[PDB]
Amino acid sequence: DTVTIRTRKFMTNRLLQRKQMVIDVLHPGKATVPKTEIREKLAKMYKTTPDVIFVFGFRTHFGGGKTTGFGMIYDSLDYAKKNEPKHRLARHGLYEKKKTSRKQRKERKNRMKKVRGTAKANVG
Amino acid sequence: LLLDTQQEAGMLLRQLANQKQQHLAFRDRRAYLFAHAVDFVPSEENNLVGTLKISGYVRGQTLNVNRLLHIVG
Amino acid sequence: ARGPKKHLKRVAAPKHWMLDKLTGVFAPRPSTGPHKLRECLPLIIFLRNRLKYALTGDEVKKICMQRFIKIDGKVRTDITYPAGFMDVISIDKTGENFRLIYDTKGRFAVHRITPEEAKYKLCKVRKIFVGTKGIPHLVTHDARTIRYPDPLIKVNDTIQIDLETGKITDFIKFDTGNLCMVTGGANLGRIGVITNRERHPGSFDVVHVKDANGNSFATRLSNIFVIGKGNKPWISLPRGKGIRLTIAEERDKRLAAKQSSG
Amino acid sequence: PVARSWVCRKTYVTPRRPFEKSRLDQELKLIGEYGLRNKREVWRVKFTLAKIRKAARELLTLDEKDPRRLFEGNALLRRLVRIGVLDEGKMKLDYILGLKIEDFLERRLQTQVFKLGLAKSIHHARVLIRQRHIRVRKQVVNIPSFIVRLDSQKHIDFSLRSPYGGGRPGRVKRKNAKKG
RNA sequence: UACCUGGUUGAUCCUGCCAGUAGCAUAUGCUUGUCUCAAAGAUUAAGCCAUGCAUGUCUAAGUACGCACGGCCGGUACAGUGAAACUGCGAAUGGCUCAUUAAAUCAGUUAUGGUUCCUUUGGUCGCUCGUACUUGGAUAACUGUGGUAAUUCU
RNA sequence: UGGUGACUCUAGAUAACCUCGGGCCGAUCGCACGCCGGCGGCGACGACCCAUUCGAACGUCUGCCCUAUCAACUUUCGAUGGUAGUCGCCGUGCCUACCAUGGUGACCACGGGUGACGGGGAAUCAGGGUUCGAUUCCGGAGAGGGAGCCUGAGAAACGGCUACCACAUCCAAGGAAGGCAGCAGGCGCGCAAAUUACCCACUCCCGACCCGGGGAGGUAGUGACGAAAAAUAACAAUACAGGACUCUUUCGAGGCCCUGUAAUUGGAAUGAGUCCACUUUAAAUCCUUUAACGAGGAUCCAUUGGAGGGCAAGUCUGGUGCCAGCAGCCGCGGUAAUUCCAGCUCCAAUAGCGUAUAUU
RNA sequence: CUCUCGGCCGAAGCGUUUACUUUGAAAAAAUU
């Protein structure tokens, strides 16, 4: 109820099909609010569904007042999937990263470098 | 060093295999041996004495028979 | 080195790009092109650091590869493309037209231009040569070789050319009493009238330029760009008219703006 | 190569003579007057004042109509007026050399909290600032060496989350009131 | 902050050094509650290296006859994704170190009217008076048979 | 024709040449398909030659530490110059042939040394100066040492090849394979220096490329190199104790503050830590934000040096007795030791403080 | 300080040449 959302420098980026803005969250009593509440409040603020709003980079000031982050509202989910980084899509469950580490596939790459032809696909 | 995983164990054996060795002088001047296998043949069981066959690796100096042998205990 | 270098450090980058000191180790190394890398804005810095349309270099790549950016009416997808002086950048999706014109302090000011001004550009001709069965050729400051020019156009003159055809519309002769702008040295970005040009054969010839407020300075021929015939410029000028203010006047204007706007 | 900056300064100088009774007494008098932790805070204020006076003395060597001298002199004068060390009437480059260390020590947040009646002692003021009971305008300031600007002095408050401010009494009162 | 103090004599004044004093960098000792930055196998050995990684790369647009595929509709020349391989590019950048080096390197200043230059950008590409509605031989990948104790061998 | 400060420049005209180890003069792919049996709109790969960009490479002028117990050096084997050529991308003893005897030097040539890569810069400093600069930016050099190459626009390349020299790996004894002064790591060396971690999210770079890759770089771990901020407690009432204002000849009488001893009391505020959660981030950690717990002196206990002088702070007490030792220097210690070894107390700086060494 | 070519001025020589001093334009960023 006491959580207040305010928007600094705002721009409609038609080159990436979004609206980008700086968000201040005023929460004088509580802790740093979760991203879901901020997404819902931007959703009711800008009359758009919260499934397309992406927020990040929230730093809480010393003392315990404002929290400043960055937010983007896309036109559709298709543009959001095409233009967000894969990691901010994975925070909403729209991406799945491979479970293989670096060292495993580096060593696999060298091992199949040692072999020639269609036998490359056999090793692993 | 950590001992939690067999990879850490292999790292620890690699570390122990390659160290600067600290040398004790008392070991290096005598001819010592650690008994790997001990066999006994009694001369007389009532006498409770006999010949001992202690087998192991010579580690100190060159082991000469004419010198006396001290068993530490 | 054993061949040409491909990287560029941020602290060794040109200062007019206004790059940070802790964002990275590497600056955008500009690709080879019509402008020197010391005297250009790469498209990544213009789209990301100046216009703020992109937040990262990945977003710059994502905008450029969707074919929205034109430089001199040509779609460019190279994000480190060297864009230079008098240069027209068109973004048709947002309906914006910018000219890269030097700022008063020596940087590339983003100067939004009206769309019918985005049809032409000014070029300083670098050399004249007759080749291939008596055909004369111009070479300009941005490496546009133009065959069959007007015979009155000489070296150090400037030409207004239409970008869609690449052909000369009309030219300004290098002479005293003309309006010019400085592209190099300490006086970079200042606009004034040519007073006189002194000759030093076998060396650099020096030009004296007088400001609209009576301020005189000098440069070389390699740093002069004639932008107007007489006093009226052939292009729109930035918010500052090319008049360099001293630090006292800048401080006074800043305090006046602080007093006016609170 | 790394993306790191290595610019750093030392904010004080150790004195030339280790054991001189007059200097020891004067520094301990400053510490007692202003409730400072050690000699290093005195040396830090002294070093700041020495830098200011060196800058002014370098400025006074130039001609009176020099542009650098005028620009840097008015910059230094406005900076010293804004922290409340110089006054508007005596805003001249010659008066800067007449400045004291005790002039700069009055401008600390500790001294200003003690003077405004928010605290009953200078040590109590340092404690109260360190305990996050003091706010300036709206920011909670935890640093006692916070130099108070002249336009920032008029509103130093009790930081509403504090027990002495709005409410929410602290750990001790909650524990003692929950006895029966 | 433009500074000095102890020590040659019975005592004094000098010359004069030794010692003291403060900073800065390495090392080391004792000690160490919080928070922000942050150098770090240079010095001696440009000594020697187990192991692992550090340079790879496909768009609608060079070559697809590997069912490797869910899969067209079926005489559909080539539907699409596509391992492998050929072709092209890059691997001459970056990173490391400071052994060599004393008008050498390097710095500022100038010349190439004495040279080359992948790439990018612009110019040029019926300006030559002399089977084309498409030319030829292979070679990988694939199938099959092997050699050596051993190799990114063939 | 056009230009330069100056062409043996550019362009023009003529007579020919034009290399089989050969010069350009498109037998290439994609997307939409549409108009008078035939014409076509965009784009991608191409291409001899110009110019442009990134360069690179050879030159011009001036500038570097010590050394004369280095005073003459260079030229048979190019040293200085001329002529013609060879080679080279080009200018040139770059090399050859034929000639001339020149060239550098006390204004320090030549030789030797350097615990010498050079600059940007750093420490210190009144002013002048001294010293440092292996070290992230620019330039050079080199991949154990030398040498010679292939490919290529670009390398005399070393995470390319071929040798020799020195090391060194697997052997079935015939053969085969090497190069951490990359990132971690190990040995050795030493007074002297960190993890065989995670990621390509940021910065950029490479590729046929919006897609792949990057020990570049980023993020954590170690880190008292060094720098910045900053706890270890504050207050109130009483009992003594001072110093002031009023009234008193004075003594004294008070309501005015201050100070510690508190072997006196009292609740309030807290961060350290414990630890949900959010935030941070590629995923984390940390910081920040926050619930809950977390403070009475036997604790949540601050050290390092010193106490004759220089130089701040004991002629205290006990022990030792020219011993042990202290002492940068002057000196102390041989029975009243202000100096040793301890106890107490005191002094300086304080999360820091000693000591050795280089330097100012 | 001036004789010739061009619109009271611009070109051409200067003036024995320097040293000195003042000004102008070139002297990467970072660091100061």
Side-chain angles (χ1 to χ4, degrees), chain C residues 44-105:
Chain C
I44 190 167
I45 297 186
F46 184 68
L47 285 170
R48 192 257 305 275
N49 296 121
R50 295 290 96 83
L51 291 174
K52 313 273 178 186
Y53 273 139
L55 293 163
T56 52
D58 201 339
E59 273 168 4
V60 171
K61 179 257 295 176
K62 203 168 291 184
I63 292 172
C64 293
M65 283 300 306
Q66 195 174 2
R67 300 182 72 87
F68 289 144
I69 317 299
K70 282 175 193 254
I71 297 89
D72 289 332
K74 298 294 293 295
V75 186
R76 296 277 177 253
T77 80
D78 187 24
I79 64 167
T80 57
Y81 184 80
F85 187 53
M86 293 297 102
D87 190 359
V88 181
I89 297 169
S90 296
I91 306 172
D92 308 69
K93 182 67 181 294
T94 55
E96 273 160 323
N97 297 291
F98 314 98
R99 193 171 305 261
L100 291 183
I101 283 174
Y102 277 120
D103 200 66
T104 301
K105 293 182 177 67

Side-chain angles (χ1 to χ4, degrees), chain A residues 30-115:
Chain A
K30 274 76 69 177
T32 304
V33 297
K35 292 179 181 178
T36 57
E37 282 80 340
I38 305 169
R39 276 168 67 215
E40 280 149 327
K41 292 182 184 293
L42 276 296
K44 279 73 176 175
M45 185 180 288
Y46 283 93
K47 296 183 290 294
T48 301
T49 52
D51 71 344
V52 74
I53 302 172
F54 293 94
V55 290
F56 60 96
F58 284 92
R59 291 305 192 298
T60 306
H61 298 141
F62 190 83
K66 293 182 182 179
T67 311
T68 314
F70 209 80
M72 294 182 286
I73 319 167
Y74 283 76
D75 305 336
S76 66
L77 271 177
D78 294 293
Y79 284 126
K81 290 171 185 179
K82 291 174 70 175
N83 297 312
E84 288 303 280
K86 300 293 186 291
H87 75 90
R88 282 200 291 266
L89 292 163
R91 283 174 195 169
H92 298 73
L94 307 174
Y95 194 53
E96 292 180 353
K97 186 180 287 292
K98 51 199 173 181
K99 299 289 94 175
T100 51
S101 77
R102 292 178 70 244
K103 176 76 79 172
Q104 296 169 22
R105 69 212 180 222
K106 310 289 268 294
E107 293 193 281
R108 190 194 192 268
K109 165 180 79 71
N110 286 321
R111 259 185 280 120
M112 65 180 288
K113 214 191 292 169
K114 276 183 178 182
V115 297

Side-chain angles (χ1 to χ4, degrees), chain D residues 116-134:
Chain D
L116 294 174
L118 315 167
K120 52 186 69 63
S121 180
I122 191 72
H123 309 282
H124 179 227
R126 195 180 182 110
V127 163
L128 271 174
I129 290 152
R130 206 62 199 154
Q131 297 295 322
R132 297 168 65 150
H133 292 306
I134 303 299

Side-chain angles (χ1 to χ4, degrees), chain D residues 27 30-31 36 39-46 101:
Chain D
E27 294 171 317
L30 276 178
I31 287 161
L36 309 171
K39 296 289 180 74
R40 222 192 291 123
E41 311 201 326
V42 176
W43 296 342
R44 163 172 74 202
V45 181
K46 193 186 298 293
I101 177 170

Side-chain angles (χ1 to χ4, degrees), chain D:
Chain D
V2 288
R4 302 185 192 121
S5 176
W6 309 300
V7 184
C8 49
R9 293 181 184 271
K10 189 163 272 298
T11 61
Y12 73 104
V13 296
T14 294
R16 186 41 164 91
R17 298 203 188 274
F19 313 107
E20 175 200 356
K21 297 188 181 71
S22 308
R23 199 197 33 92
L24 292 169
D25 291 337
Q26 188 274 331
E27 294 171 317
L28 184 51
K29 277 183 157 206
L30 276 178
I31 287 161
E33 280 168 66
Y34 290 90
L36 309 171
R37 203 181 59 241
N38 48 2
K39 296 289 180 74
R40 222 192 291 123
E41 311 201 326
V42 176
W43 296 342
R44 163 172 74 202
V45 181
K46 193 186 298 293
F47 181 64
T48 299
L49 172 60
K51 271 176 149 177
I52 281 149
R53 295 180 67 250
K54 180 180 180 180
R57 185 177 65 247
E58 190 276 331
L59 280 176
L60 287 169
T61 51
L62 310 166
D63 288 16
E64 209 272 314
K65 61 174 73 73
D66 204 66
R68 184 160 87 72
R69 184 195 188 268
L70 280 155
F71 183 79
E72 182 180 352
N74 295 244
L76 179 64
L77 284 156
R78 186 273 304 278
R79 285 200 291 108
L80 285 159
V81 162
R82 198 172 64 161
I83 51 172
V85 175
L86 269 169
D87 288 331
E88 187 277 303
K90 67 181 178 67
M91 198 176 139
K92 211 172 277 172
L93 214 56
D94 291 331
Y95 286 118
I96 277 173
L97 297 173
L99 262 53
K100 299 289 94 176
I101 177 170
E102 293 83 3
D103 284 352
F104 282 87
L105 280 149
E106 294 293 328
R107 301 311 301 157
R108 288 169 93 261
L109 189 61
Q110 198 182 317
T111 309
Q112 289 311 308
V113 164
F114 172 58
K115 289 296 189 293
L116 294 174
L118 315 167
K120 52 186 69 63
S121 180
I122 191 72
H123 309 282
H124 179 227
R126 195 180 182 110
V127 163
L128 271 174
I129 290 152
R130 206 62 199 154
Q131 297 295 322
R132 297 168 65 150
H133 292 306
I134 303 299
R135 71 169 183 170
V136 174
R137 68 181 65 252
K138 272 176 197 174
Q139 177 72 70
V140 182
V141 187
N142 199 47
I143 314 299
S145 67
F146 180 90
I147 296 297
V148 192
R149 285 173 198 170
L150 202 65
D151 76 270
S152 176
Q153 195 201 291
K154 291 174 71 175
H155 40 275
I156 295 158
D157 190 358
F158 292 101
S159 78
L160 281 81
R161 299 261 300 161
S162 66
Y164 313 107
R168 183 56 192 303
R171 191 212 302 182
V172 171
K173 188 173 287 294
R174 291 194 301 273
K175 203 159 163 293
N176 284 333
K178 197 175 69 176
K179 280 185 181 284

Side-chain angles (χ1 to χ4, degrees), chain C residues 15-189:
Chain C
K15 185 172 169 59
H16 65 99
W17 291 354
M18 294 182 286
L19 296 186
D20 289 337
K21 218 168 60 172
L22 279 75
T23 309
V25 177
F26 286 109
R29 171 90 178 187
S31 54
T32 58
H35 304 275
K36 297 177 79 74
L37 63 84
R38 270 313 191 160
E39 293 151 23
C40 78
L41 267 184
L43 190 54
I44 190 167
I45 297 186
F46 184 68
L47 285 170
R48 192 257 305 275
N49 296 121
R50 295 290 96 83
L51 291 174
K52 313 273 178 186
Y53 273 139
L55 293 163
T56 52
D58 201 339
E59 273 168 4
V60 171
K61 179 257 295 176
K62 203 168 291 184
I63 292 172
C64 293
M65 283 300 306
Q66 195 174 2
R67 300 182 72 87
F68 289 144
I69 317 299
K70 282 175 193 254
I71 297 89
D72 289 332
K74 298 294 293 295
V75 186
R76 296 277 177 253
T77 80
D78 187 24
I79 64 167
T80 57
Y81 184 80
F85 187 53
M86 293 297 102
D87 190 359
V88 181
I89 297 169
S90 296
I91 306 172
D92 308 69
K93 182 67 181 294
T94 55
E96 273 160 323
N97 297 291
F98 314 98
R99 193 171 305 261
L100 291 183
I101 283 174
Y102 277 120
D103 200 66
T104 301
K105 293 182 177 67
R107 318 173 287 231
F108 266 118
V110 64
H111 167 68
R112 291 161 195 273
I113 62 175
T114 303
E116 69 274 15
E117 183 178 1
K119 288 178 192 177
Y120 66 94
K121 85 174 289 181
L122 298 182
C123 294
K124 184 192 175 187
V125 62
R126 297 302 191 58
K127 53 207 280 174
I128 306 297
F129 68 98
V130 182
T132 181
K133 293 182 183 293
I135 298 165
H137 303 83
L138 298 174
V139 190
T140 62
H141 81 295
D142 53 355
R144 320 163 75 91
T145 62
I146 298 139
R147 63 204 296 262
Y148 285 136
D150 186 316
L152 282 72
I153 302 166
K154 298 294 154 184
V155 163
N156 295 125
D157 299 346
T158 59
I159 54 173
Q160 180 196 126
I161 58 169
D162 184 44
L163 291 170
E164 293 83 3
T165 54
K167 291 174 72 174
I168 288 173
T169 59
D170 57 316
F171 69 100
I172 312 180
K173 182 63 65 68
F174 177 77
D175 212 340
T176 185
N178 267 321
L179 198 80
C180 70
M181 184 177 177
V182 182
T183 58
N187 299 326
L188 199 155

